[PDB]
Design a protein around this ligand. Structure first.
Ligand SMILES: *[C@@H]1O[C@H](CO)[C@@H](O[C@@H]2O[C@H](CO)[C@@H](O[C@@H]3O[C@H](CO)[C@@H](O)[C@H](O)[C@@H]3O)[C@H](O)[C@H]2NC(C)=O)[C@H](O)[C@H]1NC(C)=O
Ligand SMILES: *[C@@H]1O[C@H](CO)[C@@H](O[C@@H]2O[C@H](CO)[C@@H](O[C@@H]3O[C@H](CO)[C@@H](O)[C@H](O)[C@@H]3O)[C@H](O)[C@H]2NC(C)=O)[C@H](O)[C@H]1NC(C)=O
Lengths: 50, 51
C-alpha cells in the first residue's frame, strides 16, 4: 500500500544503478523517496562495475 | 589478478624479510574466491601466483 509512505519502485534498476545513472534508470534522477523497493528482475545495462 | 563476473580481487606481492619460521623467512598470503553458478572464474598473473 503506497498512500502513507512515499514508495519508489526500482523496476529494472537497483538503487546503485539509479545513483550512478544507468541510462535505463534516468527516470529516477533526482527523485526523493521514503521507501525504495529493489526488484529481483532488476539488471544493470551499462559499464561493468563493482 | 583473481576475477569473477561479479567481483574482482587483486594483490601485489610485498617483498621484504620476515622472521624465519622453520628456516623459511618468506611468507604466503592466502585468499579465496567463490564462484556462483553461471559465472566463470578467471586468473590473470605475471608472477608470484600459487594457483
Ligand atoms: C523492465 O525490464 C523488462 C525486462 O527487461 C522489460 O520488459 C521487456 O520490455 C521490452 C520493451 O520495453 C519488451 O520488448 C518487446 O516485447 C514485445 C512483446 O514480446 C515484442 O513484440 C517486441 O518485439 C520487443 O521484443 C520485452 O519483451 C519485455 N520483456 C518481457 C519478458 O516481457 C520492461 O519493459 C522494462 N521496463 C522498464 C520501465 O525499463
Ligand atoms: C634481517 O634480520 C633478520 C632477523 O635477524 C635476519 O634473519 C636471520 O638471519 C640469520 C642469518 O645468520 C639467521 O641465523 C640462522 O639461524 C639458524 C638457526 O638454526 C642457523 O642454522 C643458521 O646457520 C643461521 O645462523 C636467523 O635465523 C634469521 N632469523 C632470525 C629471526 O634471526 C635476516 O637475515 C636479516 N637480513 C635480511 C636481508 O633480511
Amino acid at each position: 500500500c503506497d498512500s502513507p509512505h512515499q514508495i519508489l519502485d526500482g523496476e529494472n534498476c537497483t538503487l546503485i544503478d539509479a545513483l550512478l545513472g544507468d541510462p535505463q534508470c534516468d527516470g529516477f534522477q533526482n527523485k526523493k523517496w521514503d521507501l525504495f523497493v529493489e526488484r529481483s528482475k532488476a539488471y544493470s545495462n551499462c559499464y561493468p562495475y563493482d | 589478478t583473481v576475477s569473477t563476473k561479479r567481483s574482482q580481487q587483486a594483490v601485489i606481492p610485498n617483498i621484504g624479510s620476515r622472521p624465519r619460521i622453520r628456516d623459511i623467512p618468506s611468507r604466503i598470503s592466502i585468499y579465496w574466491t567463490i564462484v556462483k553458478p553461471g559465472d566463470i572464474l578467471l586468473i590473470n598473473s605475471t608472477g608470484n601466483l600459487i594457483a
